[PDB]
Design a protein around this ligand. Sequence first.
Ligand SMILES: Cc1cccc(Cc2n[nH]c3cc(O)c(C(=O)N(C)c4ccc5c(c4)OCO5)cc23)c1
Length: 203
Amino acid sequence: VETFAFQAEIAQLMSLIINTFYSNKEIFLRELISNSSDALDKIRYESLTDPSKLDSGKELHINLIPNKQDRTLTIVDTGIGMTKADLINNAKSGTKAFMEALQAGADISMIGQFGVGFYSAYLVAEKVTVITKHNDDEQYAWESSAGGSFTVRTDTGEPMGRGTKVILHLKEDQTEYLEERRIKEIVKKHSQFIGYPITLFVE
Ligand SMILES: Cc1cccc(Cc2n[nH]c3cc(O)c(C(=O)N(C)c4ccc5c(c4)OCO5)cc23)c1
């Protein structure tokens, strides 16, 4: 298990997201779905010149998996995935412009325009786990409960083939994001035009 410190600006952004009074928390789902869509675009693009890239999985989709027992909402995609280098690297410039925008009068819902939309996960989650598998690397698990650090480790769990899984360990008062009707309403409102199938799993 490797422990890393977040770069100062990211730690600051994460503190801002956790501490600011902001009721419109549902925006986290649109940000994660949009990141999944971008990774799916990357694998679809790379597969045109090289079809062997789809050997780790042909289907390009997004699955939303609520688990009331574990209090987790999982966003799974069969996108390009991330290598260990991509995982650790993937923000400093966007983070800076976003803080400045907020002070100027902008709101947390514009987070995606600065390429740091992922951190909106901390509006609803006390801990985020990211499992990823890229064709050029092994399966890795990234994890952070904020507090200025994150861990990275080789994942020993079930192989994914290719893609990224975001496991949101929800805060006690945010269990509405495990409800079928609530998830449906959010996806309809903010992610109506994603160019990939979004399957909401039922329990
Ligand atoms: C811990 C950690 C490290 C890095 C990035 C994230 C953000 C993230 N959230 N949900 C995702 C789903 C994905 O398929 C990917 C992914 O496989 N790719 C290649 C990806 C990379 C950057 C992106 C992106 C897609 O969308 C715009 O920014 C990432 C993310 C989280």
